[PDB]
RNA sequence: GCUAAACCUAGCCCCAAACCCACUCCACCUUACUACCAGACAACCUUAGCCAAACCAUUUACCCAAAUAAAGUAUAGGCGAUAGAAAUUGAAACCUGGCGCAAUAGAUAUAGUACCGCAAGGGAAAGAUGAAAAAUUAUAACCAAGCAUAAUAUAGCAAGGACUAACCCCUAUACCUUCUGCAUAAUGAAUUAACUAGAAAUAACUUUGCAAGGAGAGCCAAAGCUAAGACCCCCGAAACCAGACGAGCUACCUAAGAACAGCUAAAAGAGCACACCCGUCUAUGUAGCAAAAUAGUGGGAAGAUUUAUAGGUAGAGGCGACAAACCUA
RNA sequence: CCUCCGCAUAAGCCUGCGUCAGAUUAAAACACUGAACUGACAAUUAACAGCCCAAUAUCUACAAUCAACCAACAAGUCAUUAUUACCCUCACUGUCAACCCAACACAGGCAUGCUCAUAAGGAAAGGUUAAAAAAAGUAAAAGGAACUCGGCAAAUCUUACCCC
RNA sequence: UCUCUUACUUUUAACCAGUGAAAUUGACCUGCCCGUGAAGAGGCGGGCAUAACACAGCAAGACGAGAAGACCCUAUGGAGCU
């Protein structure tokens, strides 16, 4: 689960625990490192989801929905938009079921597009003096809303259904804690009727 | 407890109550044939036969009889890329044998796979692939070479 | 296995736990006695030179009459100053390689951009 | 790469850093005093310029001085101003033979001491240069009194300075009761002394030693919390009622 | 004197996006056709304007 | 050579090696005259469990509980938690005395009660 | 086979940079700055050769006055050697004595 | 066209500035990585030597207080190779860089890992596509030694003169080094690719600048003074000294063990002869099974015998039934 | 057909021919699939051996060799009492293998018990021919050292003399 | 052992299949006789000989190969011993 990298991996559109993964680069590889603009975490701005614009490519100008997000490239891939073709049921006898495969765009060619006028834009992060940080709109002055994403738990809270070894939500909430003075260790002792008479004699630390 | 610093006994001191304990057990499917009696677990390093008892009479009300502990040497032998030894780690199994008379057999936990779910995510993707394989595999000896698309 | 989430979600779950009872356990000694660390020790130093956190080891006769305590040296014996010097002239090496490589790494982004 | 300070400024960064920058400060002068000693094995000029031969020029002239081996017996007892010598010596006086090497121990005795500020007699390992030293000070007591530190060079005399001077400023009942004027004649004979009491302790102390007495006195087995807690809620809840 | 060789490599790419992940193919097309027209059998028969 | 790298076990030197050396496990007793192991029943671990019968809660949570901000739990936190109302109402009433402190639950030194907290008598 | 097949990366140099255009400014000040500072004062490098020129063994005996009280161990043992190297071959082998 | 070639970037070097780090739980001086019991033993010590004096016996800069100057001066020195001050003068606080390298280079390093050695210790090599490998595509081919496509044709340092034609015709004693002299049958080289060897002063020559003065304090001067240019190699010994590491082989000793069938047994450091120890002679082998073996033939085999375990004696030495024998081939 | 081997213990090494899949490649001095392997999985369970003794004083001259005569010298391998203190019990480690030291799957080296040829344990020949030279054996007409520095090797079984 | 060697078996050896080294190597299109030469020629002079290519033996020559001769001498090179 918690595998360490090596210090000069490559990011290789998939995810790094992946089969495809290990084929690609396993440990037996040390190739150049790929030099990468840096960018804070606070000046970040498109997120996995938001309507974005492609600049230049095989179709410049058109719109689409990015579905997933590579932070240690600067990588997005447009949903179903900067494509190329490659074949998936691959055999000696057969290979057909071309399908459309995407290709990841640099944060400098995707730029942002805001809702009421359909147009690329670029963002600043405006800080809102009601206490929260959301995107404003440079040239147009709206706010750009982070827009709502099915995360990586896979799971959707309201139709989420309690099986039999998952506690119910009045129960995990319910005030029991009484802060005392003793340690678990006795109360549990003196909860449970045990008792013990004799002392703990002297021990010498060093 | 494991990894713990144990209270040290002077004699005629208290009884030693570990609470919150940090042993962790696997029960396994033995690889020789083993009596009707014999159950055999997997524990760490760091418990011995009458933790192993106190253990199993204590959460799971199990009757133990008697307890027999093996260390079992793990592989030293794999070599890595760079021709430095991996070390496949260490292990204790235990077999135990129940006190009444009862027995054990390991059950089944993989048979039978009956599921047939809706598919979108996967089974759609598996669907086109079998409809192309089924359409598309339409090849034919006495055309010699020359495609199967042309209406002429 | 048919779903491993299971096992890490009892096991950082477990954790949670062990240090939510820990948090208890030290502040509860905090306020009894007013020290942390409840293993108790002391800052020595042994052979090597090197200055180490030596915990104590719960023996049951007093250290001034144990056998085996008193041949475990505690102290320098001036000929180590010498090896002493030299690991701090190594890791002084590699503090300032790494910082030249940093400085490196800066002014070729700075290069490219 | 280079260190910023020098390989022998180490020791007074160390002085300067942790638990000896707490020391007190009269300890940390009398460390880095570093005084001559007085010449003992070598015969010292008597100006500074010297009218030699074979040119009427004056020229400048020093006294260095011999680097002397202690032994740690040199430690357990009063020597003099002396230990070993350890050098190397020409055969026939001419230095067309071979070079040898050769060490000059002093000749050693065994004498009973007494003293009168502390009452008690001392089997020493004194040598004779003590023996006239003592005399040209007409007492065991001045002579240890009175030659500073770096002409004992012995740590058994810096303790029998530092028991002295204790003694003396504590104005302890010294010899014992039924004869106070006793007491108060031998304080009134050594009274060109006796530095105050808390400057008397870390007379003829070594670093180690000072190191282990200064983290004696700061041992202090931490506080509860809960005492500083109670004292944090009625300072408040006084100043709440107070108000 | 040791050494061995390199490259062992496959000729069969698979399913591995759903091996997991959180990104699905945006596919273009469907498998086949809904269903089939079936052409009358007499068209050629029929091949004027209408009958 | 030997076998310089990997670690030293139980398993590697001869006969007196073997049995000295063991694996980790604490032991539970002393050696006899007669080579017999003599057990002691005080140092045994006994694994003290609660009974299930009553017991309401599961090892997972359900996903609809709504999520808190972390605050560790501090010292001052529990001194105004459980003290802080105590001796606040006796110094109300002006019973409260800064001499004897034992009776807020502050014990002096840990020596006469069984499970002493800077030592840690118990075990976890 | 040494050469390289495909040619190299076309390097572009900017002769209009902050230090090409500025090299020489504030030297040749002495002359006309009324004489405050020298034109060794402007050298910047190690602090043992500012203003000094010396052969090779000079800069080792000079390194080794002014800086080798601060040297590392290594670095203090490689300069003895080589300052007995440096002098026992250029007082004792070579031509034209 | 096979083997193959090519890559830039991990990184590293030299300076400036700045004083640098070390307990998440457990274990770690006993056989370190071991939870738990009574003699408490303990550190303070001129370096030496290679080398120079063409030998060598006194002697030979290394010493840890910033520069320049005084000055290589007074001085010391088989007064010789060389060593070498002092009085005095003063020493402008701050700027994150490279006419440094790029996988046989730069730290040994992807690494003190693998591997070798009981032990101290020694100690390597290497990767290359791409925007997308969630694009396996068709290209990218073109270049060293070695081969194949494609063996040979009478004669001769492999070549030159040529000719209508390659051979056939005429001439022609490979290279470097050391030598009076090498084709010499004297030394070195299978080939290819990379790496691999002239570092500096006083005094002179030329070119500027100034001129009885020159020079950014000190120094020189009866045309001199300042500045620049130009000029002095690599690899290789047996040896010496100092500090560590070794008696698991072998030399000896100590503690407690084990083995010696059968016959004649004269009682036996007795006889034949097993197991065992040793290796007299012959033959095979000599890059071998083996960096000392195999087969035959041998001596001892109840004693000064052989051998397992642990410990002890270490190099100016240990040990030695003295072979100057052994001390990890 | 061979056995001068083997089974265990001790020492040493540390999973090193068990199952499944890959065997397209990768080691088999050749392949099958497996002693010169890749990945995964499972084994070795103590009664066998280690892991030991509460103190203070005190006691301990008559070897072993069937130990019974006889007979010795090099003179030997084994034992307690008095007093006090002492009432709980079966924890831990090793248990596999075709294996260890010699750069190797090396005609080498390796301590003890067991049957001294066997109930264990193994295969000198990849296939054809019958060249020369070489090595190991068998047999040989007549002579029996005439060969050679030397009866060196082989076969028989062998006397006397000299030097040390 | 020999006069005086011979026959047979195995290993070895020759042919077929597989795996598959090492010392050595200036380039060689690499003959004989006489003479010459740094004094002993396959490479020079004069004659003679001469279609090309393997396979299996022999050791007369290539001053044949492995060891910067261990015999002799030199070095203001070492070391043991008396
Ligand atoms: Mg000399
Ligand atoms: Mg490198
Ligand atoms: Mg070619
Ligand atoms: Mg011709
Ligand atoms: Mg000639
Ligand atoms: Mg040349
Ligand atoms: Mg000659
Ligand atoms: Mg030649
Ligand atoms: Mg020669
Ligand atoms: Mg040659
Ligand atoms: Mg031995
Ligand atoms: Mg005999
Ligand atoms: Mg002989
Ligand atoms: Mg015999
Ligand atoms: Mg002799
Ligand atoms: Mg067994
Ligand atoms: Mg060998
Ligand atoms: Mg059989
Ligand atoms: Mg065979
Ligand atoms: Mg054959
Ligand atoms: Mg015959
Ligand atoms: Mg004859
Ligand atoms: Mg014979
Ligand atoms: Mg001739
Ligand atoms: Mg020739
Ligand atoms: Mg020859
Ligand atoms: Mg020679
Ligand atoms: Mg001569
Ligand atoms: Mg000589
Ligand atoms: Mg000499
Ligand atoms: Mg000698």
Redesign the pocket.
């Known amino acids: 689960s918690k595998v360490t990298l090596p210090?000069?991996y490559?990011?290789?559109?998939?995810?790094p625990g992946?089969v495809?993964?290990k084929?690609?680069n396993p440990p037996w590889?040390?190739?150049?490192?790929?030099?990468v603009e840096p960018i804070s975490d606070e000046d970040w701005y498109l997120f996995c989801g938001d309507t974005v614009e492609i600049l230049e490519?095989?179709d410049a100008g058109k719109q689409g929905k990015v579905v997933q997000v590579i932070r240690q490239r600067n990588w997005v891939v447009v949903g179903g938009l900067?494509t190329?073709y490659?074949?998936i049921g691959?055999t000696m006898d057969y290979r057909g079921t071309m399908i459309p495969?995407?290709?990841?765009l640099?944060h400098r060619q995707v730029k942002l597009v805001d809702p009421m006028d359909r147009k690329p834009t670029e963002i600043e992060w405006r800080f809102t003096e009601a206490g929260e940080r959301v995107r404003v709109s440079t040239r147009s002055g709206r706010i750009i809303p982070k827009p709502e994403f099915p995360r990586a738990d896979g799971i959707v809270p309201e139709t989420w259904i309690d099986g039999p070894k998952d506690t119910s939500v009045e129960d995990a909430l319910e005030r029991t804690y009484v802060p005392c003075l003793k340690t678990l260790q006795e109360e549990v002792m003196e909860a449970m009727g045990i008792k013990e008479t004799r002392k703990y004699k002297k021990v010498y630390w060093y | 407890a494991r990894?713990?610093?144990?209270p040290?006994?002077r004699?005629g001191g208290p009884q030693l109550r570990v609470f919150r304990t940090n042993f962790f057990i696997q029960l396994?499917?033995?690889?020789?044939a083993?009596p009707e009696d014999?159950v055999?677990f997997?524990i760490p390093?760091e418990?011995?036969?009458?933790?192993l008892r106190n253990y199993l009479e204590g959460i799971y009300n199990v009757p133990v009889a008697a307890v027999?502990?093996?260390?079992?040497?793990?592989?030293?032998?794999?070599?890595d890329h760079?021709?430095?030894?991996?070390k496949?780690p260490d292990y204790?199994?235990a077999?135990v044998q129940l006190a009444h008379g009862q027995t054990f057999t390991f059950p089944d936990l993989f048979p039978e796979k009956d599921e047939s779910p809706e598919g979108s995510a996967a089974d759609d993707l598996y669907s086109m692939l079998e409809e192309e394989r089924q359409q598309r595999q339409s090849s034919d000896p006495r055309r010699g070479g020359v495609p199967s698309w042309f209406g002429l | 296995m048919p779903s491993p989430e299971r096992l890490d979600k009892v096991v950082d779950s477990m954790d949670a736990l062990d240090k939510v009872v820990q948090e208890r356990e030290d502040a509860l000694r905090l306020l009894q006695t007013g020290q942390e660390?409840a293993?108790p020790?002391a800052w020595r130093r042994?052979?090597?030179g090197?200055?180490?956190?030596?915990?104590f080891?719960?023996?049951?006769?007093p250290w001034?009459?144990?056998?085996?305590y008193?041949?475990?040296?505690?102290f320098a014996?001036?000929y180590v100053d010498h090896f002493l010097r030299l690991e701090?002239e190594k890791?002084?090496?590699i503090?300032?390689?790494?910082?030249?490589?940093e400085?490196?790494?800066?002014?070729?982004l700075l290069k490219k951009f | 790469?280079?260190?910023?300070?020098?390989?022998?400024l180490?020791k007074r960064?160390?002085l300067?850093?942790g638990i000896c920058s707490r020391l007190p400060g009269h300890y940390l002068r009398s460390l880095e005093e570093e005084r001559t000693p007085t010449p003992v094995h070598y015969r010292p000029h008597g100006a500074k310029f010297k009218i030699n031969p074979?040119?009427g020029?004056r020229?400048?002239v020093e006294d260095v001085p011999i680097?002397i081996?202690?032994?740690?017996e040199s430690?357990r007892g009063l020597w003099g101003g002396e230990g070993w010598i350890?050098?190397?010596i020409?055969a026939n006086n001419d230095?067309?033979?071979?070079?040898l090497?050769?060490?000059w121990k002093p000749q050693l005795f065994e004498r009973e001491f007494y003293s009168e500020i502390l009452d008690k007699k001392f089997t020493v390992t004194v040598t004779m240069r003590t023996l006239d030293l003592i005399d040209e000070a007409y007492g065991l007591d001045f002579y240890i009194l009175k030659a500073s530190g770096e002409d004992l060079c012995s740590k058994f005399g810096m303790d029998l300075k530092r028991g002295m001077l204790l003694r003396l400023a504590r104005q302890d009942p010294q010899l014992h009761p039924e004869d106070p004027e006793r007491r108060a004649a031998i304080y009134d004979k050594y009274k060109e002394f006796a530095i105050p009491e808390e400057e008397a302790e870390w007379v003829g102390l070594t670093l180690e030693e000072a190191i282990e007495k200064q983290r004696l006195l700061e041992e202090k087995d931490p506080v509860p919390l809960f005492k500083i807690y109670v004292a944090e809620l009625i300072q408040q809840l006084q100043q709440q009622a107070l108000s | 004197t040791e050494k061995?060789?390199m490259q062992?490599a496959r000729?069969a790419?698979l399913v591995?996006?759903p091996e997991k992940?959180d990104?699905?193919?945006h596919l273009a097309c469907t498998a086949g056709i809904f269903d089939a027209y079936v052409p009358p059998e007499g068209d050629a028969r029929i091949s004027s304007l209408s009958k | 050579?030997?076998?310089?790298?990997?670690?030293?076990?139980?398993?590697?030197?001869?006969?007196?090696?073997?049995?000295?050396?063991?694996?980790?496990?604490?032991?539970?007793?002393?050696?006899?005259?007669?080579?017999?192991?003599?057990?002691?029943?005080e140092?045994v671990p006994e694994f003290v469990v609660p009974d299930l019968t009553g017991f309401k809660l599961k090892p997972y949570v359900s996903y609809l509980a709504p999520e808190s901000e972390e605050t560790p739990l501090t010292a001052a936190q529990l001194f105004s938690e459980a003290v802080a109302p105590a001796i606040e109402k006796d110094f109300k009433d002006g019973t409260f005395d800064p001499d004897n402190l034992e009776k807020y639950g502050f014990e002096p030194t840990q020596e006469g009660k069984l499970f002493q907290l800077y030592p840690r008598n118990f075990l976890r | 086979?040494?050469?390289?097949?495909?040619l190299?990366?076309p390097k572009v140099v900017d002769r209009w940079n902050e230090?090409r255009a500025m090299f020489g400014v504030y030297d040749?000040?002495?002359?006309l700055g009324n004489?405050?500072?020298?034109?060794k004062?402007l050298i910047?490098?190690?602090?043992?050769l500012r203003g000094?020129?010396?052969?090779?063994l000079?800069r080792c005996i000079?390194?080794?006055?002014?800086?080798?009280?601060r040297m590392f161990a290594d670095?203090?043992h490689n300069l003895?050697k080589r300052?007995?190297?440096?002098?026992?071959?250029?007082?004792?082998?070579?031509?034209?004595?």
């Open positions: 210090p000069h490559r990011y290789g559109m998939s995810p992946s495809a993964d084929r690609k590889i040390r190739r150049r490192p790929v030099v490519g095989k900067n190329h490659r074949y691959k495969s995407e290709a990841p640099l | 990894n713990v610093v144990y040290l006994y004699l396994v499917r033995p690889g020789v083993q014999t055999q997997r390093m418990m011995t036969r009458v933790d027999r502990t093996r260390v079992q040497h793990g592989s030293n032998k794999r070599r760079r021709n430095v030894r991996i496949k204790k199994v077999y | 660390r293993r020790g042994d052979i090597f090197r200055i180490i956190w030596h915990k080891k719960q023996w049951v006769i001034h009459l144990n056998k085996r008193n041949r475990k040296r505690f014996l001036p701090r890791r002084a090496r503090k300032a390689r790494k910082e030249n490589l400085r490196k790494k800066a002014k070729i | 790469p280079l260190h910023k300070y020098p390989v022998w180490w960064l160390q300067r850093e074979k040119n020029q020229e400048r680097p081996y202690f032994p740690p430690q350890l050098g190397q020409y230095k067309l033979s071979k070079r090497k050769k060490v | 061995e060789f062992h000729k790419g591995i996006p992940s990104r699905s193919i | 050579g030997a076998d310089r790298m990997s670690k030293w076990t139980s398993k590697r030197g001869p006969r007196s090696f073997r049995g000295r050396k063991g694996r980790g496990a604490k032991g539970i007793g002393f050696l006899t005259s007669g080579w017999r192991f003599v057990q002691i029943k140092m | 086979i040494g050469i390289r097949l495909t190299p990366p230090k040749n000040i002495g002359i004489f405050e500072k020298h034109p004062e910047r490098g190690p602090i043992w000094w020129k010396g052969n090779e000079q000079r390194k080794r006055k002014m800086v080798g009280s670095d203090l003895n300052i007995r190297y440096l002098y026992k071959h250029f007082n004792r082998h070579g031509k034209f004595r």
